[PDB]
Enzyme design. Structure first.
Site, PDB file in Angstrom:
ATOM      1  N   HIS B  43      -4.866  62.773   7.148  1.00  0.00           N
ATOM      2  CA  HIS B  43      -4.298  63.052   6.110  1.00  0.00           C
ATOM      3  C   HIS B  43      -3.428  64.361   6.243  1.00  0.00           C
ATOM      4  CE1 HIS B  43      -7.560  65.950   4.782  1.00  0.00           C
ATOM      5  NE2 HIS B  43      -6.452  66.338   4.356  1.00  0.00           N
ATOM      6  N   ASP B  99     -10.389  59.144   8.140  1.00  0.00           N
ATOM      7  CA  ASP B  99      -9.367  60.178   7.811  1.00  0.00           C
ATOM      8  C   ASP B  99      -9.334  60.910   9.574  1.00  0.00           C
ATOM      9  OD1 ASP B  99      -7.480  61.942   6.793  1.00  0.00           O
ATOM     10  OD2 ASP B  99      -9.094  62.908   6.003  1.00  0.00           O
ATOM     11  N   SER B 198      -8.353  71.614   5.829  1.00  0.00           N
ATOM     12  CA  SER B 198      -8.243  70.244   6.411  1.00  0.00           C
ATOM     13  C   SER B 198      -7.928  70.056   7.803  1.00  0.00           C
ATOM     14  CB  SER B 198      -6.927  69.445   5.755  1.00  0.00           C
ATOM     15  OG  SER B 198      -7.167  69.305   4.169  1.00  0.00           O
TER      16      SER B 198
HETATM   17  C1  LIG Z   1      -6.576  70.090   3.210  1.00  0.00           C
HETATM   18  O1  LIG Z   1      -7.059  71.435   3.608  1.00  0.00           O
HETATM   19  C2  LIG Z   1      -7.832  69.935   2.098  1.00  0.00           C
HETATM   20  C3  LIG Z   1      -9.263  70.512   2.539  1.00  0.00           C
HETATM   21  C4  LIG Z   1      -9.961  70.441   1.118  1.00  0.00           C
HETATM   22  C5  LIG Z   1      -9.711  71.102   0.134  1.00  0.00           C
HETATM   23  N1  LIG Z   1     -10.522  70.998  -0.474  1.00  0.00           N
HETATM   24  C6  LIG Z   1     -11.742  71.092   0.236  1.00  0.00           C
HETATM   25  C7  LIG Z   1     -11.305  70.426   1.300  1.00  0.00           C
HETATM   26  C8  LIG Z   1     -12.421  70.131   2.216  1.00  0.00           C
HETATM   27  C9  LIG Z   1     -13.716  70.266   1.994  1.00  0.00           C
HETATM   28  C10 LIG Z   1     -14.203  70.754   0.993  1.00  0.00           C
HETATM   29  C11 LIG Z   1     -13.260  71.120  -0.164  1.00  0.00           C
HETATM   30  N2  LIG Z   1      -7.847  68.453   1.711  1.00  0.00           N
HETATM   31  C12 LIG Z   1      -7.321  68.059   0.629  1.00  0.00           C
HETATM   32  O2  LIG Z   1      -6.893  68.631  -0.441  1.00  0.00           O
HETATM   33  C13 LIG Z   1      -7.290  66.621   0.543  1.00  0.00           C
HETATM   34  C14 LIG Z   1      -6.049  65.878   0.843  1.00  0.00           C
HETATM   35  C15 LIG Z   1      -5.920  64.731   0.025  1.00  0.00           C
HETATM   36  C16 LIG Z   1      -6.400  64.936  -1.388  1.00  0.00           C
HETATM   37  N3  LIG Z   1      -7.611  65.790  -1.051  1.00  0.00           N
HETATM   38  C17 LIG Z   1      -8.691  66.371  -1.666  1.00  0.00           C
HETATM   39  O3  LIG Z   1      -9.563  66.966  -1.176  1.00  0.00           O
HETATM   40  C18 LIG Z   1      -8.653  65.841  -3.358  1.00  0.00           C
HETATM   41  C19 LIG Z   1      -9.660  65.058  -3.374  1.00  0.00           C
HETATM   42  C20 LIG Z   1      -9.235  63.361  -3.021  1.00  0.00           C
HETATM   43  C21 LIG Z   1     -10.350  62.666  -2.170  1.00  0.00           C
HETATM   44  C22 LIG Z   1      -9.948  61.371  -1.633  1.00  0.00           C
HETATM   45  C23 LIG Z   1      -8.622  60.865  -1.778  1.00  0.00           C
HETATM   46  C24 LIG Z   1      -7.706  61.542  -2.744  1.00  0.00           C
HETATM   47  C25 LIG Z   1      -8.081  62.991  -3.450  1.00  0.00           C
HETATM   48  N4  LIG Z   1      -9.075  66.922  -3.837  1.00  0.00           N
HETATM   49  C26 LIG Z   1      -8.371  68.213  -3.794  1.00  0.00           C
HETATM   50  C27 LIG Z   1      -5.279  69.907   2.737  1.00  0.00           C
HETATM   51  F1  LIG Z   1      -5.338  68.569   2.301  1.00  0.00           F
HETATM   52  F2  LIG Z   1      -5.321  70.602   1.616  1.00  0.00           F
HETATM   53  C28 LIG Z   1      -4.307  70.009   3.597  1.00  0.00           C
HETATM   54  F3  LIG Z   1      -4.207  69.324   4.613  1.00  0.00           F
HETATM   55  F4  LIG Z   1      -4.225  71.282   4.067  1.00  0.00           F
HETATM   56  F5  LIG Z   1      -3.149  69.904   3.057  1.00  0.00           F
END
Ligand SMILES: *[C@](=O)([C]([C]C1=[C][N]C2=C1[C]=[C][C]=[C]2)[N]C(=O)[C]1[C][C][C]N1C(=O)[C]([C]C1=[C][C]=[C][C]=[C]1)[N][C])C(F)(F)C(F)(F)F
Ligand code: NA
EC number: 3.4.21.5
Lengths: 10, 250, 28
Positions: B43, B99, B198
Site C-alpha cells: 500500500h 500487503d 506504514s
Molecule cells: C501508513 O503509515 C499507515 C500506518 C498506520 C496508520 N495507523 C496505524 C498504522 C499501522 C499500525 C497501527 C496504526 N497505514 C494506513 O493508514 C493504512 C493505509 C490504507 C488505509 N490504512 C489504515 O490504517 C486505515 C484502516 C484500513 C484498513 C484496511 C483497508 C482500508 C482501511 N486506517 C487509517 C500510511 F498508510 F499512512 C502510509 F503508507 F504512510 F501512507
C-alpha cells in the site's frame, strides 16, 4: 522541512 | 510511533526510508533484507482510494538513516529502484490482505555499522516466536500522535495479541496473512505505530541464535494508540514462498 | 545477507541495546 539531497540522486 | 522513544544509533541498521523525489517527502518505512532487496507494504506504492500508484522512477530509498529530515552526509546511502514487485493478490479493495512488496535496487548497497540486513523467518523461528504475549519491536518516523513528526527514528516494543481479540476489536475482515499487536487496556502500557510508519519492520530477536528476524510489516490500524484497538501487520512468514519466488527469478 | 540479524554495533561487539531484554524476557 526535509534537507535537500544532492542533485546526483535528483 | 506513539509512546515510543528515540532509537539508539545503529539499533535498526535494516531500517529504510521511502522517499518521494518530487515533492521531496517521506512516504513510508521499509527494511533491508539483502544488498539489493528492500521489503515494504504494497500500500506504500499502490492504493487507488488515495490515488497512489508509484513507479520506480518516482522514488528513492534512503538507507542508514537516523535523522528524519536531514541528509546525513557520509552515513546514509540513497538508492534508486530498478524494479518494483507487488504481490499479485494484494487486496487494496477491502482489507489490505497480502500487503507486501519487494523493491530491487539498481546497485547493491555496501553494508556498514549503520546499514545491515535483517533476517527473514523460517518455519521453526516463526512457530516458536509468533506467540501471543511475546514482544516484537516496531520502528519508524511516523506521527507521534493522532488517531507531530519526530526528529529521529522512534522505537516501541509491543506484545503479539491473540487472534480472537484481534478480530473482536475491528469490523474489518482479518485474514491469516495478518497478526495484530499492542497492549490491552488493562495492561497499563501503551504504544503503537501511526501514520507514516506504514511499511516498516516488526522484528523479534531469536533467543536461540541471537539474530533479529522480521516477522511483520506495519500495515494498518484504526486510530493510533486507542484503548481496545490494535495495530495490524503483514504476516511475513505466511508470504515467504512469494518472496523466495520473486528473488529466485528476477 | 548470511550475517543477517547481527548488528555491527551490538551483537557483533556483544553490546545490548537499552530495551532488548524486555523482548527476551517475554519469550516465555
Ligand atoms: C501508513 O503509515 C499507515 C500506518 C498506520 C496508520 N495507523 C496505524 C498504522 C499501522 C499500525 C497501527 C496504526 N497505514 C494506513 O493508514 C493504512 C493505509 C490504507 C488505509 N490504512 C489504515 O490504517 C486505515 C484502516 C484500513 C484498513 C484496511 C483497508 C482500508 C482501511 N486506517 C487509517 C500510511 F498508510 F499512512 C502510509 F503508507 F504512510 F501512507
Ligand atoms: Na470483528
Amino acid at each position: 522541512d526535509f534537507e535537500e539531497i544532492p542533485e546526483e540522486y535528483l | 510511533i506513539v509512546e515510543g522513544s528515540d532509537a539508539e544509533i545503529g539499533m535498526s541498521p535494516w531500517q529504510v526510508m521511502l522517499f518521494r523525489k518530487s515533492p521531496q517527502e517521506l512516504l513510508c518505512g521499509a527494511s533491508l533484507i539483502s544488498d539489493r532487496w528492500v521489503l515494504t507494504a504494497a500500500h506504500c506504492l499502490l492504493y487507488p482510494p488515495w490515488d497512489k500508484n508509484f513507479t520506480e522512477n518516482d522514488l528513492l530509498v534512503r538507507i542508514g538513516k537516523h535523522s528524519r529530515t536531514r541528509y546525513e552526509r557520509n552515513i546514509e546511502k540513497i538508492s534508486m529502484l530498478e524494479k518494483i514487485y507487488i504481490h499479485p493478490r494484494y487486496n487494496w479493495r477491502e482489507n489490505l490482505d497480502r500487503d507486501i512488496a519487494l523493491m530491487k535496487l539498481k546497485k547493491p548497497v555496501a553494508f556498514s555499522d549503520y546499514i545491515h540486513p535483517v533476517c527473514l523467518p523460517d518455519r521453526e523461528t516463526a512457530a516458536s516466536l509468533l506467540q501471543a504475549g511475546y514482544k516484537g519491536r516496531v520502528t519508524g518516523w511516523g506521527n507521534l500522535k493522532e488517531t507531530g513528526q519526530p526528529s529521529v527514528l522512534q522505537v516501541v516494543n509491543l506484545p503479539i495479541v491473540e487472534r480472537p481479540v484481534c478480530k473482536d476489536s475491528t469490523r474489518i475482515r482479518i485474514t491469516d496473512n495478518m497478526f495484530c499487536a499492542g497492549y490491552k487496556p488493562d495492561e497499563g502500557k501503551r504504544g503503537d505505530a501511526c501514520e507514516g510508519d506504514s511499511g516498516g519492520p516488526f522484528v523479534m530477536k531469536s533467543p536461540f541464535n541471537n539474530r533479529w528476524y522480521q516477522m511483520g510489516i506495519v500495515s494498518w490500524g484504526e486510530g493510533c494508540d486507542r484503548d481496545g484497538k490494535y495495530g495490524f501487520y503483514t504476516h511475513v512468514f505466511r508470504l515467504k514462498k512469494w518472496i523466495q519466488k520473486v528473488i529466485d527469478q528476477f | 545477507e548470511a550475517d543477517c540479524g547481527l548488528r555491527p554495533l551490538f551483537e557483533k561487539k556483544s553490546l545490548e541495546d537499552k530495551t532488548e531484554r524486555e523482548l527476551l524476557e517475554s519469550y516465555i
